[PDB]
Write a protein that binds this ligand. Sequence first.
Ligand SMILES: Nc1ncnc2c1ncn2[C@@H]1O[C@H](COP(=O)(O)OP(=O)(O)O)[C@@H](O)[C@H]1O
Ligand SMILES: Nc1ncnc2c1ncn2[C@@H]1O[C@H](COP(=O)(O)OP(=O)(O)O)[C@@H](O)[C@H]1O
Ligand SMILES: Nc1ncnc2c1ncn2[C@@H]1O[C@H](COP(=O)(O)OP(=O)(O)O)[C@@H](O)[C@H]1O
Lengths: 370, 370, 370, 37, 66
Amino acid sequence: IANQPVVIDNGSGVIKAGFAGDQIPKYCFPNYVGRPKHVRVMAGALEGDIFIGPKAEEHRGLLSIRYPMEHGIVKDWNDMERIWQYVYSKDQLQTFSEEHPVLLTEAPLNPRKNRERAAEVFFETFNVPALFISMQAVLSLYATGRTTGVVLDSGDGVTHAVPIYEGFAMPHSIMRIDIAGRDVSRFLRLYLRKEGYDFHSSSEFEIVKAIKERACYLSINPQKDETLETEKAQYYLPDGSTIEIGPSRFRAPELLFRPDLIGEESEGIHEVLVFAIQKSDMDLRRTLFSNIVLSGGSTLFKGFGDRLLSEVKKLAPKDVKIRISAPQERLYSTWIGGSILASLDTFKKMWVSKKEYEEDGARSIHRKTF
Amino acid sequence: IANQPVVIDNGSGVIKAGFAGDQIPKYCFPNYVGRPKHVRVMAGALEGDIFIGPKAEEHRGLLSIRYPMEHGIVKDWNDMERIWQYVYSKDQLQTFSEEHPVLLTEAPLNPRKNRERAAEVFFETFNVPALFISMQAVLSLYATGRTTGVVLDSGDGVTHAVPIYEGFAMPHSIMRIDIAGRDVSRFLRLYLRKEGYDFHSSSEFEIVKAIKERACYLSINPQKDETLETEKAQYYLPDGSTIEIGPSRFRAPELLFRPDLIGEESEGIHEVLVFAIQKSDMDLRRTLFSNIVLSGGSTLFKGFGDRLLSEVKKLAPKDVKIRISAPQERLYSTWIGGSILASLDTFKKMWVSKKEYEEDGARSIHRKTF
Amino acid sequence: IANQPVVIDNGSGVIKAGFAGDQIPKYCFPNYVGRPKHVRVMAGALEGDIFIGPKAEEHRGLLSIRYPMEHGIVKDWNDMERIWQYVYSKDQLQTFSEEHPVLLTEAPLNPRKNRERAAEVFFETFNVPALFISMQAVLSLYATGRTTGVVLDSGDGVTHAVPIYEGFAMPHSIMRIDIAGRDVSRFLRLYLRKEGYDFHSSSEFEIVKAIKERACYLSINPQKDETLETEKAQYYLPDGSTIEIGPSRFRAPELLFRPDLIGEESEGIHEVLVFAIQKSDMDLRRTLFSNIVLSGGSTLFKGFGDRLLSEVKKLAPKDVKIRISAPQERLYSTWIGGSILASLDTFKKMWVSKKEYEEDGARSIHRKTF
Amino acid sequence: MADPKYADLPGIARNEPDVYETSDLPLTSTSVEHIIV
Amino acid sequence: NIEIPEISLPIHPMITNVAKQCYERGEKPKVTDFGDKVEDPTFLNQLQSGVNRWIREIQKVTKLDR
Ligand SMILES: Nc1ncnc2c1ncn2[C@@H]1O[C@H](COP(=O)(O)OP(=O)(O)O)[C@@H](O)[C@H]1O
Ligand SMILES: Nc1ncnc2c1ncn2[C@@H]1O[C@H](COP(=O)(O)OP(=O)(O)O)[C@@H](O)[C@H]1O
Ligand SMILES: Nc1ncnc2c1ncn2[C@@H]1O[C@H](COP(=O)(O)OP(=O)(O)O)[C@@H](O)[C@H]1O
């Protein structure tokens, strides 16, 4: 028994959290940790070293922003502890980690050590009454209400497709590549350098993310538009300068459909969907093609869904109704799905109790991983 | 042993000193050693061979002036020792050099030897219990309330720009040129020689300073008064003579904005500030453009604020709001900040004890430089 | 028309020219346009009033100095046009710029506008029949006769590393940071200003470059020597003076291995090499670690290769054979390889003729450059 | 403030504007489907 | 129980007078309400002494440890 389950949606770029039963996540902020770079000289300065959340975003110039999680895998656990601890601070939740069971979203095909050490972190430093690690696609489909269909997500560090059949997420059809939002921003940074504009500071990579979020689009024809000179719209920096982008705005999110530009034998998003559908039972292909759900912030580019339809039509068999849905809460899909899932009475039997974790250990988590 | 620390504004043009906690510096005498030029014949004449401050300001004609410090770098240590002894003398403080902590300011980017020898004097000739060397930028922020800003001071010898944001100084963005009030006075002297009025003695050099402070202004435009060949405003000398100037009461202070007139490629004061801001981080530009602090006596010329605004406005990107806070205590801002800092208790942790220096030496001073 | 082609090897600090076939670039001169500061009076003095070449080195003090290429990016196209005309002048090659194909050189990952405008110059002002812009790594490999090996070079403005495996350039495994010899000279000037020897004039900066190129060594132990006492070896200026460098002679070239000293989050040269190797495949890292060809001007410091092997062994996995080869004339490696490449028979197909430029334009250059 | 304090020392400039300033001035759709018969 | 003491930090009574005057009407207290009283060096000197005493009192509690 506890108060209420807290759905903490992780993400390599933006963490999202709130209590279960909530409508929208009330607490969302970037998943980075910024510590100052300069020298504390004057007294009365910004006290404290590590900053997370709105304060780290505000005084962005001083920090040396780093990410503790990359490609859905935690690289530094200390920064993650401070991030989770920040989630439970007075600025976000104002609660205690002893009276709340925790729903935790997590990307597929990740190492066992993520669930194991993350569970140790929660049940030991936080001592939560109940932890429950789950997928992300299952939650997104629960958020849309329907039940069978694939889920195409592309967050900040991962991207995958999961063919879900009535909740049983088919584990033998989850294609997963590691080319997501942050990497698109990284490649955009490279193209900005090729344009002439240099951005290499860690607290400037964020400006590159801002440019990706408000100045890029997806060309329908990938090559016909490359053979033309666009209008070259400008961009206003926080500094007040001006950057004319040019061709570095459509080729930047082109990476998601062709990771040859980054030099990698992986596949595009369209191939992840088509391979995820084709590596399933032939009796469900039409049902999966009639139900595609997008989620994740990288599915917010202009002309994304339209280009995805064109690509899938080029790869799907002829005269099969393809249908891509795209709800208005792609950033909040996994969190809303967590709010629906954890607010049910079956969640009591679906979690892992603290007592159980102390009895068996990590094997209990891998046992009851679904 | 400590009671009311002694704040010393070791400025190359005028030394300002008093105790800690004092709202105003009680003793502001000029920084020069006056030695006589004419032999003493009559008994009962003036006593001593060294005149400092108020005495070397009334009997100026009898003296030959030797500035000890030039461009924030001490030349004759003997003279600085004598000036500091004058500070602790009966006519100035009546204290001992062993009962009070000493806060002695310093310009940024000075050589290490100044710090070393300054502490050697204050720890060997004077047996000061506590010594702390500071920056002449942080102190102005203290005495002006702000904690984020660009300190643009122009003392009599060295001008610089230090961008401090939220109490954090960004040392790599410090720009510093060695062209200030001395050069303006000296260049004014050359303009008087081109206008037929020579001055070569050291005692008459202060009359050139007097002309500068009482008759020099800055035109908003460098050519709207250049070819106009304006009126010749008269100005009286200390004897009763008459000097008409005309094209030198504005041509001499433009040496700060363009030191090409002195025959030295460097950057003007406006380029010092703008380059100090542009060298800082991308996110911190608007806050530094809206927080510009002025200090130093050379920032008292007429029309200085308007010229500084228009020059920065030309160099800053469009529509960026530029605010230049110009307090009325530009001469005593650094001292008042010193009186504030030494009145705190964190200063106790910030100084260097005598045994600290004895067991370590110069190393201890370079350790607590910031 | 296909005569002896001209191999122009650009460099942000020292240009290199000469015909294809010469074993040594017969015409080398620094890359700076010097123009006089002082007013000329005596009729019959130096003429042209824009000095480029050895005349700019013989009369350094008389003129101002401004570099037209910073970090491999051309900032002033007018000055580069004058420099290239000087390459074709009566003092360097004495030939016409239309009877010879030109082999230019560039640092990788440069902006496309440099390549565009550079070929615009070589095809519009100079009516060169054929131009072929190319990298530097490939050229140093043609010079050493090899076909494999990671080429690491630290020029005056660009420190990049491009790996090549049997003639297959890996474009995505290229690391380039703009922290080079010019910035080391600048950091040295900053430390000299912290010493007392404040060199500030533009023509005086070359003296700092000479001091860097002569009295500077890289200690193997970073913090051991970085925190201890020096010996203060004396150096003779061109004035006939004497300067005691001291501790800055070793802390100034440390910038190449840790750019945190200048306050810029980047990587050292060793991290550049290690990351450039690791970004490649898994079946090539052994051949790349066993074949490292140094080049570039700044890879001549005393005690440089020692520190590279130490840092690389700390970064590379254990028991991996690490070798570092280098040519004898390290300053003219790329030019020699350019002479070899341009003197081949495939160079007739490698270039871009003038008719090709008239048909397509910039697009043809971007196509045939890779 | 300390007005008599400023009367004491000689550098404090009165009747000069103390602050110089620059002038001032006053998501995608859903169900992107495509049938095929 | 050791029962750590408490300190009631005094305030200048004139400030409370004008504060209560701002409270009799619906209005937030502000610096502008004192008029030409802020410029009094006597008044500000009294205030400086009071805040200095406040710092003393708070240090009496913050430096405490057992
Ligand atoms: N409007 C936008 N256009 C393109 N990309 C965006 C946009 N908004 C956010 N992003 C990218 O999407 C990412 C958000 O996905 P995220 O919520 O992090 O997924 P997860 O939380 O599962 O990691 C952010 O990293 C951001 O880079
Ligand atoms: N009213 C004034 N107007 C213009 N310049 C002044 C005025 N008063 C003083 N100065 C100049 O400014 C200098 C003041 O020295 P200061 O700026 O305090 O140097 P430092 O900061 O090194 O003590 C004087 O030497 C004089 O050159
Ligand atoms: N003995 C030396 N020690 C250290 N650096 C040196 C020495 N000799 C030359 N250099 C550096 O070599 C650089 C020249 O490199 P350069 O061949 O011009 O590269 P690029 O041609 O790519 O510009 C100069 O900037 C100088 O700093």
